[PDB]
Structures are given as C-alpha cells and as structure tokens.
Amino acid sequence: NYIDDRIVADVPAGSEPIAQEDGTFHWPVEAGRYRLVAARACPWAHRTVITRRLLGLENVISLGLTGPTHDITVPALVEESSKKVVTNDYPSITIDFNLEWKQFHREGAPNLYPAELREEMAPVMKRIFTEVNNGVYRTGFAGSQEAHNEAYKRLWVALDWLEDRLSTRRYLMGDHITEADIRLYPTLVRFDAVYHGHFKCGRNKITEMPNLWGYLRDLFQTPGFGDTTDFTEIKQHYYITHAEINPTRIVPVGPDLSGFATPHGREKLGGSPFAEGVTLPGPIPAGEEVKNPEPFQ
Amino acid sequence: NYIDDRIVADVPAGSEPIAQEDGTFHWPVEAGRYRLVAARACPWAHRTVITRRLLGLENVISLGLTGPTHDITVPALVEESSKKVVTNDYPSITIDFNLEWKQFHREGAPNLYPAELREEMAPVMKRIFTEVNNGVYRTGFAGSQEAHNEAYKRLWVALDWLEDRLSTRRYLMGDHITEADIRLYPTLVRFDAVYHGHFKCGRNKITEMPNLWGYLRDLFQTPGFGDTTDFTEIKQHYYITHAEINPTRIVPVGPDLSGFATPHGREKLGGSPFAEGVTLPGPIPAGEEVKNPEPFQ
Numbered sequence: 001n002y003i004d005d006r007i008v009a010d011v012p013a014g015s016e017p018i019a020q021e022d023g024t025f026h027w028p029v030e031a032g033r034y035r036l037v038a039a040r041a042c043p044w045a046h047r048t049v050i051t052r053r054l055l056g057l058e059n060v061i062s063l064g065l066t067g068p069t070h071d072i073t074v075p076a077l078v079e080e081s082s083k084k085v086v087t088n089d090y091p092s093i094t095i096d097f098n099l100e101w102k103q104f105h106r107e108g109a110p111n112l113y114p115a116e117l118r119e120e121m122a123p124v125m126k127r128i129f130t131e132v133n134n135g136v137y138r139t140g141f142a143g144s145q146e147a148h149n150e151a152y153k154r155l156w157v158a159l160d161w162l163e164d165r166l167s168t169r170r171y172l173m174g175d176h177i178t179e180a181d182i183r184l185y186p187t188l189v190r191f192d193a194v195y196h197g198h199f200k201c202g203r204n205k206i207t208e209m210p211n212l213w214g215y216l217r218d219l220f221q222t223p224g225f226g227d228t229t230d231f232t233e234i235k236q237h238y239y240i241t242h243a244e245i246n247p248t249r250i251v252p253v254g255p256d257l258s259g260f261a262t263p264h265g266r267e268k269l270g271g272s273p274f275a276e277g278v279t280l281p282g283p284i285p286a287g288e289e290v291k292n293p294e295p296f297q
Numbered sequence: 298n299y300i301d302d303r304i305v306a307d308v309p310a311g312s313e314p315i316a317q318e319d320g321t322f323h324w325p326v327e328a329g330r331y332r333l334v335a336a337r338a339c340p341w342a343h344r345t346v347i348t349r350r351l352l353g354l355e356n357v358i359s360l361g362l363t364g365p366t367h368d369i370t371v372p373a374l375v376e377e378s379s380k381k382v383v384t385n386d387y388p389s390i391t392i393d394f395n396l397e398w399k400q401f402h403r404e405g406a407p408n409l410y411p412a413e414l415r416e417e418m419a420p421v422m423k424r425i426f427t428e429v430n431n432g433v434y435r436t437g438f439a440g441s442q443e444a445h446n447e448a449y450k451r452l453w454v455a456l457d458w459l460e461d462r463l464s465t466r467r468y469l470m471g472d473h474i475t476e477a478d479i480r481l482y483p484t485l486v487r488f489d490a491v492y493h494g495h496f497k498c499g500r501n502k503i504t505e506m507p508n509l510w511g512y513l514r515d516l517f518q519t520p521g522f523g524d525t526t527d528f529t530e531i532k533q534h535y536y537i538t539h540a541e542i543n544p545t546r547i548v549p550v551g552p553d554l555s556g557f558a559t560p561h562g563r564e565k566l567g568g569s570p571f572a573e574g575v576t577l578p579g580p581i582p583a584g585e586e587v588k589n590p591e592p593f594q
Contacts, residue, residue, distance in 0.1 A: 205502060252449075254498075
C-alpha cells in the first residue's frame with residue numbers, strides 16, 4: 001500500500017483530488033483538512049515531525065501519534081474527514097511541506113530546501129539514505145554473518161565520509177540547516193541509544209566521532225529537533241518490539257545521554273542554524289510535547 | 298562438582314594427596330604432574346593464564362585450552378596421569394601459584410601478592426568480584442527489567458569508584474601490578490568488546506572513562522596480559538553461544554580495538570608495572586600464543 005499522491009499549491013482549496021498523467025492524484029493545500037500520522041520511535045516519521053515544527057505547520061496540519069511500521073504505514077498524511085491515506089511517500093512529504101505549503105508557514109520560517117543547493121543536495125541525501133539511514137537496518141537485520149559484515153563496512157565508509165565532510169562545513173550543506181540535516185539527524189540521534197548495540201553497528205559511539213558528535217549536539221539543541229526526540233519511546237520500541245533480535249525484551253538503562261546538552265563547539269565553523277531574520281518556532285502545542293523528557297529537555 | 302583441594306609447598310613431591318581436618322586434601326607442588334585447563338573466552342580462566350605466564354610456570358604446569366563453563370568446570374588444575382580434577386577453586390589457584398609455587402617461579406619473577414598489601418587487598422578484590430566481575434553477568438543475564446536496572450546501577454557505582462581510585466594510584470594497590478589487577482583486567486578487557494552491548498552494560502564505553510582506559514591499556518601492553526588475550530575467541534564465545542540472549546548468533550564486527558595499542562599516559566602517576574630488578578616473561582611457548590592476533594598483537 002505505497003501511496004504517492006501529493007498535496008500541492010496549484011490545486012485549489014476544497015477540490016477533490018485531481019488525476020495526473022502519471023496515475024497519481026494531486027490534492028490541495030489547505031488548513032484543517034489533513035493529519036500527519038507519525039510515531040516517536042520511527043526515524044522516517046521523525047523527519048516529518050521536525051519539518052512540521054520548524055515551518056510552523058502545527059496549527060494547520062494536525063498530529064496523530066501511533067506505532068512504527070517500516071522497521072497503516074507511518075508516516076502518512078491522512079484526510080481527517082474520510083480517513084483516506086493521501087500519501088506515505090515520506091521523501092515527498094518533507095519536500096512538499098517546504099515548497100507547496102509556503103503560504104501556511106510561520107512568517108519568517110527558514111528556507112530548508114533552497115533552489116541553489118537542490119542539485120548538490122540530491123546525491124548527498126541519496127548516499128546518506130542507502131548507506132546510513134537504511135545502512136543501520138541492513139546491519140541490524142542481517143540474516144547471516146556475511147551480510148552483517150558487508151552492511152557494517154558500508155555504514156562505516158559513509159560515517160567516515162560524513163565525519164570528514166562536517167570537518168569543514170557547519171552542517172551538511174554549509175552554513176545553515178537544510179533538509180539534508182533533517183534526514184540525517186533521526187539516524188544519528190538513535191545511534192548510541194539503539195543502533196550501536198541492538199543493531200550491532202558499534203565500531204565506535206557517535207560520542208567518539210568529534211565532528212559528528214558536535215553536529216549532533218548542535219542540531220539536538222535547536223528547536224524542532226531535541227523537543228521532538230523521546231528517548232524512552234525510541235529505546236522501548238526497538239528493544240521490546242524486535243523480539244527476533246532481543247528475545248528477553250529488556251531495555252538497557254544506558255547509554256548516559258547527558259552529553260546531548262553540553263556545549264558543542266561548532267560555532268568555530270561559522271554559520272548558524274538559521275539565516276539572519278529567520279524566526280524560531282512558537283511554543284510546542286499542548287499534547288505534542290515529549291512525554292518522557294530527560295532532565296536536560 | 299566444586300573441588301577445593303590445594304596444591305601446596307609443605308606436601309612433598311610424589312606424595313598422594315594428604316587429608317586435611319576440613320575434609321579437603323593437599324597435593325604437592327612438583328613439575329610435570331599437573332595441567333591447567335583453561336578457555337580463552339572465560340575471564341575467570343584468564344586470571345590463571347596471566348598469572349602462569351607472569352610467574353614463569355609455563356614449563357612446569359602444562360596448558361589445555363577448551364570451552365567456558367561458568368557463564369569439567371574451567372579453570373581447573375588436573376593431574377595429567379589420572380585425569381583427576383585437583384581443584385577448580387579459581388581464587389585459590391592464583392594465590393597458590395604466587396605463594397606455594399615460589400621455588401618454581403622464573404628467577405626474578407614479580408611478587409604479585411605481597412604480605413604488606415594482603416589485608417587492604419581483600420576488601421578491594423571482594424568489592425570488584427561482586428559488583429564488577431560478577432556484576433556484568435548479573436546485568437547481562439537479568440531475567441526481568443527490574444533485575445537489569447538494579448544490576449546495572451550496582452555495576453556503575455563500582456566502576457565510578459574504580460575510576461576515582463585509579464585517579465591517584467597507577468594500579469589498584471599503588472605503584473606496581475598485583476593480584477587485584479589480574480582479577481580486574483579480564484572484565485575490563487572484555488567490556489567494550491562484549492559486555493557493553495551483549496550484556497547491556499553500556500552506560501559508557503571504557504574508552505570514555507579516562508583513568509580506567511589508561512589503566513586498561515597499560516596492563517594490556519604488559520607481558521602476560523595482551524599476549525594471552527584473544528579478542529576473536531572472546532567475541533565468538535559470547536555472541537554465538539548465548540543464543541537465549543542473541544538468537545541470530547551474529548558477531549558484531551566492532552568495536553574498533555586499535556586503541557589498545559596507543560600510548561596510555563599512566564607514567565605521570567609514577568610507579569611501573571613491576572618492581573626494580575623484576576625479570577620479564579620469556580618467549581610464549583609454541584602452541585600457547587594467541588591464535589587470532591589483532592594487527593597490533
């Protein structure tokens with residue numbers, strides 16, 4: 001049930017979905033019609049939640065929290081009145097939040113997907129997707145030793161590439177946060193907590209990779225990122241649910257997460273999370289706050 | 298089949314075992330009569346192997362390598378001619394190697410259990426045994442979340458105590474290596490490789506505990522320690538054998554172990570592995586070398 005309709009600016013409010021030549025349908029951007037159905041534990045869903053918060057779409061698209069499915073399919077945009085699933089194509093969801101929903105953004109919202117960077121961004125995001133975002137899952141769910149070995153090697157070639165890329169750039173695409181960072185963060189923020197041990201990805205902890213760790217902290221401490229990250233629900237989901245990997249269903253007490261709140265040192269690379277004049281997200285809506293905050297959240 | 302006979306200096310060579318008032322028997326120290334039956338993966342056995350090497354007992358007590366049992370019982374001293382198990386009481390094995398086998402030590406061998414330190418050493422070793430040596434097993438084999446939580450807390454109270462103790466002392470009992478270090482090393486050397494993930498003990502890696510990590514490297518780089526440590530057999534045993542914890546039986550490629558060979562910085566605390574005039578072990582006997590050496594071994 002892969003559904004790749006799109007919600008777009010050039011279909012007008014109130015319209016039925018409009019058939020496209022490619023067999024899909026295009027639905028209209030409008031307030032109060034659609035719900036984002038997400039899960040705290042799921043990294044793919046996490047992208048959509050972060051983007052919704054950063055752009056100030058919280059008051060125009062509602063939020064439902066459920067359980068993960070990729071590890072109805074989540075994340076999804078759902079038409080509230082009919083419960084039809086409009087789309088579960090998570091890459092187009094965040095691109096469309098940025099480009100199609102512009103007139104509903106908070107005034108002063110960041111430009112997370114700027115025209116001049118889109119071309120160079122495409123291969124960077126593809127490499128991150130196959131070798132890192134999916135790379136952890138291929139390592140963790142490997143069905144043989146040989147499959148583990150290869151997946152692990154691929155993951156670490158890519159993490160070493162990222163560590164080097166981020167030695168001279170504050171964020172993946174330079175001075176400011178972009179869509180690329182929103183696609184990388186959900187993997188990195190779950191790494192020491194889950195993927196390191198549960199998925200056997202641990203050559204090193206992210207805490208031992210200086211550029212990635214500085215970058216991870218810098219993002220975590222930015223609105224939209226840490227305040228949508230529930231470490232308890234992340235760890236409970238993986239360690240309890242994946243009984244074929246962890247039959248005892250015990251959740252480790254560790255790692256110590258207190259480092260996420262420490263000074264990151266990334267200001268030495270210049271830049272800033274957002275361009276000058278960008279406004280910050282308003283207070284997180286009642287009911288959408290992290291239910292299991294760490295003492296530093 | 299707990300067997301706590303002892304091999305002692307005051308029973309003469311060739312004698313039958315001599316009945317003691319407490320129901321045990323005492324056997325005579327002599328060359329060429331007994332075999333140490335050990336396993337590379339097993340930390341309790343590892344103590345006996347390290348001590349045998351440090352003291353130069355390799356040419357008078359033979360070595361058999363087998364599989365672990367505590368996680369015949371191993372380690373054990375076995376009478377070669379009869380195959381009777383003389384003892385499997387691993388704490389008295391290493392104490393007796395030091396005190397009863399003195400006339401068979403290499404000339405210039407270290408004094409690992411000196412009279413003046415024995416009293417202060419006893420509680421330190423007991424605390425390490427219940428909270429750390431066994432502490433990892435109680436954490437890893439916990440049968441409920443609650444049992445995990447408590448065992449983890451105990452382990453880390455003790456590791457934080459050790460980290461602080463070793464901030465002002467080069468080794469556990471001061472300037473030189475003692476029996477206490479030989480009982481702690483086997484747990485620490487298996488920690489990042491196995492206990493951190495497999496036993497869910499990972500609040501932090503040992504690499505992130507500066508005093509413990511300096512100490513671990515200092516010991517690893519000393520004769521008797523690193524040259525009896527087979528990381529492949531350690532990881533294979535735990536990750537493949539403990540199918541109730543790890544049903545896939547996959548062995549992680551990580552962690553990266555290359556740090557074990559790096560400068561440890563512990564010379565700033567003074568002291569030295571051995572007292573002045575102590576001689577170093579001779580070449581490891583043919584067949585007793587680590588079969589799966591890392592590039593730095």
